[PDB]
UniProtKB/TrEMBL annotation, chains A, B:
Superkingdom per UniProt: Bacteria
Record-annotated Glycoside hydrolase family 2 catalytic domain positions: 268-575
Domain Glycoside hydrolase family 2 immunoglobulin-like beta-sandwich intervals: 175-266
Domain Glycosyl hydrolases family 2 sugar binding: residue ranges: 14-173
DNA repair listed as a keyword: no
Protein's name in the database: Beta-glucuronidase
InterPro entries xrefs: Beta-gal/glucu_dom_sf (IPR036156), Galactose-bd-like_sf (IPR008979), GH (IPR017853), Glyco_hydro_2 (IPR006101), Glyco_hydro_2_AS (IPR023232), Glyco_hydro_2_cat (IPR006103), Glyco_hydro_2_CS (IPR023230), Glyco_hydro_2_N (IPR006104)
Provenance organism: Lachnospira eligens
Pfam families in the cross-refs: Glyco_hydro_2, Glyco_hydro_2_C, Glyco_hydro_2_N
Amino acid sequence: AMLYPVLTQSRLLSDLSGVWNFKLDNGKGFEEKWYEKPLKDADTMPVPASYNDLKEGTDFRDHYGWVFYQRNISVPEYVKSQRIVLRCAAVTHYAMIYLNGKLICEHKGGFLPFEVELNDDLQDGDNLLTIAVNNVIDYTTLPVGGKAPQNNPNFDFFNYCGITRPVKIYTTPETYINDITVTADIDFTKEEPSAVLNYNVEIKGKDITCKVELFDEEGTKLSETEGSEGTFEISNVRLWQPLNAYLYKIKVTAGQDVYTLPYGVRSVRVDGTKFLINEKPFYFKGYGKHEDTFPNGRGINLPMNTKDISIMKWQHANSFRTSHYPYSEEMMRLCDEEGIVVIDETTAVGVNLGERIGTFDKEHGVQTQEHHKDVIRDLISRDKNHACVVMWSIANEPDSAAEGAYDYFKPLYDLARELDPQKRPCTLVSVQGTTADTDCSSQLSDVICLNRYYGWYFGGPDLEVSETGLRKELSDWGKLGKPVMFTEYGADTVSGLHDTTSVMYTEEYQVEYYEMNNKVFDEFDFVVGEQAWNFADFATSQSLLRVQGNKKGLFTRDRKPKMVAHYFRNRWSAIPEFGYK
Amino acid sequence: AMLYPVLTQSRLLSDLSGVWNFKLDNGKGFEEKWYEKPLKDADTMPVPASYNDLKEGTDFRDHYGWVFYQRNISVPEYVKSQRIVLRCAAVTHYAMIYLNGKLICEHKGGFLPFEVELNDDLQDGDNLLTIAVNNVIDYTTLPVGGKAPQNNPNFDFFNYCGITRPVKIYTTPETYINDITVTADIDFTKEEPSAVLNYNVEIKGKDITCKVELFDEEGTKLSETEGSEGTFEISNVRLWQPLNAYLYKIKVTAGQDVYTLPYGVRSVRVDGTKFLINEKPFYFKGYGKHEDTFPNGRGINLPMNTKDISIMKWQHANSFRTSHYPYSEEMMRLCDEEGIVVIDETTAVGVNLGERIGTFDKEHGVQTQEHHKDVIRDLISRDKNHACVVMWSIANEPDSAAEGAYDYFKPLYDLARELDPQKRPCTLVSVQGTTADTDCSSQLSDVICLNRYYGWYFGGPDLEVSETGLRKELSDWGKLGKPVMFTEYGADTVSGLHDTTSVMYTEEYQVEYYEMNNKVFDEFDFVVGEQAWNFADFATSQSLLRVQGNKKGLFTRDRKPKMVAHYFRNRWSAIPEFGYK
Ligand SMILES: O=C(O)[C@H]1O[C@@H](N2CCC(=C3c4ccc(Cl)cc4CCc4cc(O)cnc43)CC2)[C@H](O)[C@@H](O)[C@@H]1O
Ligand SMILES: O=C(O)[C@H]1O[C@@H](N2CCC(=C3c4ccc(Cl)cc4CCc4cc(O)cnc43)CC2)[C@H](O)[C@@H](O)[C@@H]1O
């Protein structure tokens, strides 16, 4: 259970962000117990941010192993009466928190929050907070790291590591609000849709009165309820809608603690080959994104988030997929405010491939299902209340058509559907090569999400031949009667390369590629969404197939529009959110 | 008096940063008293950051007038016992702070901090904090804005406005440390240089004991002193040096309040035509920078700051000038940690130009000297203790060779030299066209800082002819016997444009331009520094002479190296910090 720490009349919030003491481990780092004394010959490193690109030389960018963040923490004794918590929004990949020298916390998982209590191990004056981060990836990590001293990522994006998201401190009374949940049953039958909202507060500590208050957009009060559980009757409810968002406020007063939560009233339901939002046939318009900026790397970047959402509404999009890892809490909340449809995805990327071993080989294969279940647990525990999240993605391009694959995902799908209070659709992004008959996603998933590159990796530069292929496979996928959407498709384009008679990597070819694909898409009424790959150019590991990173983005890494970006904006302008099919 | 709010055993610090409620004024904004009720139909805007580039359309970028930031503030009553302060690191240009509807603070000045007290006007639960920002510039603002409904900046950089730097909240006991000052008298006579440091603490409130403690780099204690004033004897003092920084810690315990301060022991003194740091002949290597990134605009950007300082040490630079406005506190402190020489400059840019009026015309001219004195007051009050600041710049390219000019600056120079506890050199950046005989900087300034463009605006593309000119004027400047340095010189280069036989705007020409200039520079021993313009490409107002902004940077706006960047790195590698002349 992880609530987003905010500022409230009952709780504080001190951002530990700034320039910390930084030092690359040299192997002897742990034996010599650097976490006690200061960082001798320390360096400077801003937090939050990925450290790989913040210094020159490959030895900082391509570091293998541990790095030590160090900082000076201090609290006034008049606050020790409250509950002190250290919240780490994200640490990529493996974090180990020390306080004066005592290991107080550990976490496996570089893209989800985790907190620890500081009341017992604090001191009186200056305390030495030491956060050690590991970047190693292997068959036991999500994302998955291969092998053939450097990390070999089994994924197509750079291994940005470090304190990726903010590290803050917040307080709370002894008996506090530890978690909250809210679902909505919307009565679309009446001429005006009314709504009934069910809540459930979980307290913790030496309990015992609980109060909840409902407010609207402006802040006007609307109703009140008592107890750890209750409901709200909203006649004339203002439904959260794609691109037309509306968020109510919820103020829960429990004992000596208060916490507010913005909630969006909307319904999500799959019906045959139709993805229904608020009981209407929705069509996905957008692209798979990355949390990738320069030189922040994977580090949080609120200004760029607002710019991207501006570029999106500029382009007439409505959705994106948190490609290959969960995004920041801030970006999720922003999509609630701005009304952006989001496909929340886990870190489960790279679960694929004297003898060739098999993905799900019990002895020499991925050892990730345990942690994979944790992520599904922690991901939903965090974003369960986000009205923008309309579906979960268990994994990106796994070996979903291989032996043991179905056995691997079935418990994960179940855990997901048993944990989502709203019981939202579940899916997995199908790598190219799978078919309706071979993909275990055909049975497990509510929506089929394809990653196809007809016209690039498969068929390019012959777009004519590539078209018949795309049509042949897409037509086959209709046999399932489920909703089909493309979550990835694009061609690497180096901004600035032009040609009248186009060739691969030019801006002209990139547009043609999306014209041919979109043409086929519109031929089938069970295609309920198109999301291009990628929103913008992003960094990867070096390779002959990567022209200074991934260049399949519609925009450059600095958000500048390629010619394709205008193409889509024109297309998506004449395509509505509902009723397209 | 403005101390940098940090985290201490006696004081808190809650970063109000995040996505605030935003709304462009429409004229009726103030009459309709938006600062009381919420922002109806509000928008999203991250803080801190310039808002001009965070939304699409010229109407947000080219807005004229007011914008309303709104936010929800809340404090627990158990903290009301302390002193509550709202610190605004920067608001560009004019800020007006409301709390529940009551105007509680105002400030003129978009690039320096200002705080206000919240104890008296707080409420119990949720408070509506409303920060209104104005972007208008005219003859009464610094920077100066001209005329011929839009702002016409009298300067060559875009008018990025909004909550440019962080807005935080910090507490402190009734009797607190309000200000601190530290100077150093270094005895360079002994074989080992010892040092004596003089401090001076200023308290405020219902007083009455004061304690100060000195620590070194690691954190080991070194000495102790009592009283609001005292000294420290440092035998074997570790002198802060350019590119070899060393900062001591200073822990002042006054009553129920503590505050720590990193200090760097170094001496600055001009001797004839020699700029002496720690009694050695220093040579400036660097460039004039901007606080300009995309899409942040002028907004703070700690990751880029660390990257720029990496690029600098990569390039073998040692100094930069806070071109045309004071930079963030974080960047100043970082230069102390990283050992970067800084020329702190004020916002006094644009003080230049049926009849042609004169700059300092008493009735129809710049009405800025009053505010100009404030900035000189507040700038030194903030950065007085930064061992990286080795000189002050009263103004950039003013009309320093016109009637009334000398009368305008003389009181400003005096106020500067009377306020700097360290009595550091003072100068002003001389626009092209001035000569040793005409520039009032010849008498007022300790160091001559020239902004010359021989080979671009003046002479280009004939670099041969441009050379004789540069030599003729530079030789003349030697008549003063003072130290001369170029704070600006460069040629607009569009990254990617190449030619064997170079032309203007190509990368080849840019290198040639700096070769010719640097050749002449090295012919004169009274030239003690070279700083190119600019560090990287930055945004300006649109114009036929601006190719999508200013492109004179050595690096692109995203910090990528142009061919010139490697040229300098090779040159600056064979040029030392001391003894070059
Ligand atoms: O096209 C992208 O590369 C982007 O789209 C997705 N991406 C899709 C392409 C991927 C493949 C792959 C898998 C099966 C077959 Cl038959 C062909 C190919 C192409 C070449 C190839 C070569 C390899 O060595 C490894 N993996 C592949 C999987 C990855 C990913 O989801 C995304 O991370 C990536 O950036
Ligand atoms: O070259 C830059 O433009 C950069 O260097 C500095 N910059 C120097 C060039 C500036 C001038 C100027 C002034 C006197 C004379 Cl004789 C010629 C010229 C050139 C053209 C010209 C045209 C105008 O309409 C107004 N101002 C000028 C002053 C400004 C500034 O300090 C910096 O802000 C700027 O970005």
